[PDB]
Design an enzyme around this catalytic site. Sequence first.
Site, PDB file in Angstrom:
ATOM      1  CG  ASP A  48      -0.337   0.043   2.523  1.00 54.19           C
ATOM      2  OD1 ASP A  48       0.909   0.086   2.595  1.00 54.19           O
ATOM      3  OD2 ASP A  48      -1.068   0.045   3.534  1.00 54.19           O
ATOM      4  CB  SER A  50       2.475   2.047   4.818  1.00 53.40           C
ATOM      5  OG  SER A  50       2.194   0.667   4.799  1.00 53.40           O
ATOM      6  CG  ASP A 101      -4.778  -1.461  18.635  1.00 51.04           C
ATOM      7  OD1 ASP A 101      -5.030  -2.664  18.919  1.00 51.04           O
ATOM      8  OD2 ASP A 101      -4.271  -1.110  17.555  1.00 51.04           O
TER       9      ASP A 101
END
Length: 129
Positions: A48, A50, A101
Amino acid sequence: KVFGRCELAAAMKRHGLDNYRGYSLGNWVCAAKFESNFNTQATNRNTDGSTDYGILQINSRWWCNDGRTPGSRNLCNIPCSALLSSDITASVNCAKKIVSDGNGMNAWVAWRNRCKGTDVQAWIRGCRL
Ligand SMILES: [Cl-]
Ligand SMILES: [Cl-]
Ligand code: NA
Ligand code: NA
């Protein structure tokens, strides 16, 4: 810096990772081995666009700013280059945010595929901690 196994275990203990969110130290050492081969300088580009950085391969899409990942977030509020330091503090502090998270250590693909459900205590066997 390329860490030795026990050297990294001791550093991660000093920084509060042993049993952080219920993950024993061996989990963190195992993840670092297969994410980066214990090399703080490791980088790897993703499809992607990144990039993953450092000993725990933290991804610029969400966690750090590298100036070339459009629309990404910087949830750890750090430049990604800080994650390549021989001092693991920034990597550890950001990893604490990631593991909290909701998905635990499943955020690290190599942990899920190569560490989860194995005898991770072997990664700290023999070490003076
Ligand atoms: Cl350190
Ligand atoms: Cl969990
Ligand atoms: Na362990
Ligand atoms: Na980013």
